[PDB]
């Protein structure tokens, strides 16, 4: 259907037996009472489109995902800057994605790198994706930066932002943002269940970045990750969270200081 719905011409009824406005809500179903079984309507040929409300047009937005700092000092230097790939770091795309239970999609990661004061000097960077199980690079001159049997992107700061496409690589058939279980067997404590809700089917490796040079470069870069979902399929729709987020991998909320879903009114017998 390319349009929403057309309206049939209706009229009045004067007869017993037909009750379309007495739909019982105790059955768990939604009231199917239309306008034609009610106040007299007319013939309207609606041609309003429904294409924008689809899932592929709703999840085709990039949004901010990760912010990675790279100081590259001279005396307190590290060289590299890894970033665990997770979507729960910023509450916008998290709120947009946690309204479903199971999802399956592809990615269009984009990397925007700027300096501290803001300046595009021609410094070439190396963006490395470390899959889960591969060793992480330790140092700006490590052995792992050879990128043999490992995908990496070489780009400068004066160049346009890099953009790669990422397939679906979870060992399960779909992702999940809510895991009602435990990752392994054993006795689970009563004090602090810090492993509850953890899903090993979402650890998508680690993302590292360094500056390709010989000695050093006294510059503090700041990379931003923009992930565009595509080819997305969602299952089991879940309600939208009404409480402020507190942690990344845990949906914890405030016991006291609760936020009501609707703001307060003057009286119940007042519309304004």
């Amino acid at each position: 259907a390319e349009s929403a719905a057309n309206t049939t011409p209706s009229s009045h009824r004067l007869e017993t037996g037909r009750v379309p406005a007495l739909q019982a809500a105790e059955t768990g179903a939604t009231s199917n009472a239309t306008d034609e079984n009610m106040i007299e309507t007319r013939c309207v040929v609606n041609r309003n489109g429904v294409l924008e409300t689809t899932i592929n047009h709703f999840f085709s937005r990039s949004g901010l995902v990760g912010v990675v700092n790279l100081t590259d000092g001279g005396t307190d230097t590290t060289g590299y800057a890894t970033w665990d790939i997770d979507i729960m770091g910023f509450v916008q795309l998290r709120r947009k994605c946690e309204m479903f239970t199971y999802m399956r999609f592809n990615a269009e990661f984009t990397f925007v790198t700027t300096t501290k004061n803001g300046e595009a000097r021609p410094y070439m960077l190396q963006y490395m994706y470390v899959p889960p199980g591969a060793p992480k690079p330790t140092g700006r001159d490590a052995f792992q930066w050879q990128t043999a049997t490992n995908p990496s992107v070489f780009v400068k700061l004066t160049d346009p932002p890099a953009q790669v496409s990422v397939p679906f690589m979870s060992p399960a058939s779909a992702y999940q943002w809510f895991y009602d279980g435990y990752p392994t067997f054993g006795q689970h404590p009563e004090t602090s269940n810090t492993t509850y809700g953890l899903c090993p089917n979402n650890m998508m490796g680690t993302f590292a970045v360094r500056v390709v040079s010989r000695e050093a470069s006294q510059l503090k870069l700041q990379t931003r990750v923009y992930m565009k979902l595509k080819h997305v399929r969602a299952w089991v729709p879940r309600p939208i969270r009404s409480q402020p987020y507190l942690l990344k991998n845990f949906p914890n909320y405030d016991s006291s200081k609760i936020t009501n879903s609707a703001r307060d009114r003057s009286s119940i017998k007042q519309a304004n």
């Binding site: 259907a1 390319e2 037909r18 009750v19 379309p20 007495l22 739909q23 019982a24 105790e26 059955t27 768990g28 179903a29 939604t30 199917n32 009472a33 239309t34 079984n37 429904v50 294409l51 689809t54 592929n56 047009h57 085709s60 592809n106 496409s165 990422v166 397939p167 679906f168 595509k230 080819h231 729709p237």
Partner: protein, 44 residues
């Protein structure tokens, strides 16, 4: 107007494919076994 052309051997690196207009709303609105008629009492 042609955006169905891919430039690589892999299929996940393409753009948004043909849109699907499928809309099954009855699996969420009326998940009942006895089909409730439109002009009838839901319980008798």
């Amino acid at each position: 107007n042609f955006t169905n052309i891919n430039y690589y051997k892999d299929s996940y690196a393409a753009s948004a494919t043909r849109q699907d207009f499928t809309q099954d709303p009855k699996k969420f609105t009326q998940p009942v076994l006895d089909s409730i008629r439109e002009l009838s009492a839901p319980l008798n």
